[PDB]
Amino acid sequence: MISVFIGTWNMGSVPPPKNVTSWFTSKGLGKTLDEVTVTIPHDIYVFGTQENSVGDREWLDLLRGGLKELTDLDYRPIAMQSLWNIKVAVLVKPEHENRISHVSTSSVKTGNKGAVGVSFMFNGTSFGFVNCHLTSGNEKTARRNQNYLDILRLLSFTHLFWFGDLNYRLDMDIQEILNYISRKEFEPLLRVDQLNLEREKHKVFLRFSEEEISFPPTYRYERGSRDTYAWHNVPSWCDRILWKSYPIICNSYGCTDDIVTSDHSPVFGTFEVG
């Protein structure tokens, strides 16, 4: 058993705040990490960002530096692939570099919007992580599905994790969306999330799992706070994490609410994998 943290954050083309620990520790809204397990530094940290204005060299240092402050360890980068403002990085608890083997990165571009990928071996178990940024727009669902198909075809596993700004929107007008959000009734909204719909229609992410979403749409917020959406773009769960395990436990899945540099909130996910 190992702990694989996964984070996806569309940073709205603006640098991050110097402290994003609530992202690392799965603190905020949704299925957050309990008061005890948060103190257990995870074995692998995967950081997927879109519209990331920071440079590859420095962004990795911000990540590796932030991890040391939290864990008191010097996590070891395994791979880091970037495609314009789309960047992904993988770090590992230093006491497990010998376990890693056959590290591989890849990329695919559609349009910037695309997908960066990383895969490696941990003991006799292989992993794959895909950080994407699909076509935006309320009425471009077929485009997003086709973007997913290209990535699934143009990329170069025992456990496969697909995350990023999938950009799927809600099929409901703003009046009812805000009404349901104010009551924290997300199920009526989730029933009309395009990603759920496209999965339930067996059109994309076939046999992919996603943890129950119990946090509010991560988009689109006004920069500076979380108590308000900038819907003039209906709120939507643009930023998602799905997995497909060979014939996995999800100890958390949510978003922060104290990181307010972007119009997206950071989304996190932690898993215990074999």
Author numbering: 423 to 533, 540 to 584, 599 to 674, 684 to 698, 702 to 728
From the study:
Src homology 2 domain-containing inositol phosphate phosphatase 2 (SHIP2) is one of the 10 human inositol phosphate 5-phosphatases. One of its physiological functions is dephosphorylation of phosphatidylinositol 3,4,5-trisphosphate, PtdIns(3,4,5)P3. It is therefore a therapeutic target for pathophysiologies dependent on PtdIns(3,4,5)P3 and PtdIns(3,4)P2. Therapeutic interventions are limited by the dearth of crystallographic data describing ligand/inhibitor binding.
Finally, using a structural biology approach, we solve the structure of a SHIP2 catalytic domain in complex with a bound dimeric ligand and potent inhibitor. The related compound, 5,5′-ethane-1,2-diylbis(oxy)bis(benzene-1,2,4-trisphosphate)20 (5) (hereafter named 1,2,4-dimer), is a bridged dimer of the surrogate ligand of IP3Rs, benzene 1,2,4-trisphosphate. The crystal structure of the 1,2,4-dimer-SHIP2cd complex comprises two monomers of SHIP2 and a single copy of the inhibitor in the asymmetric unit. The 1,2,4-dimer does not occupy the positions of the crystallographically resolved ligands or of the predicted bound states of docked ligands in catalytic domain or multidomain structures. Indeed, the 1,2,4-dimer ligand fails to directly contact the L4 loop. Remarkably, we observe that phosphate P4 of 1,2,4-dimer interacts with D613. This, we suggest, precludes interaction of this residue with R682 and adoption of the L4-out conformation that, in its transient motions, accompanies optimal catalysis. While the distal binding of 1,2,4-dimer does not significantly modify the L4 closed (L4-in) conformation from that seen in the complex with BiPh(2,3′,4,5′,6)P5 (1), the compound is a potent displacer of 2-FAM-InsP5 and a potent inhibitor of 5-phosphatase activity against Ins(1,3,4,5)P4. Thus, 1,2,4-dimer meets both the kinetic and structural criteria of an uncompetitive allosteric inhibitor of SHIP2. One intriguing possibility is that a previously unrecognized substrate or product is evident in the 1,2,4-dimer (5)-liganded structure.
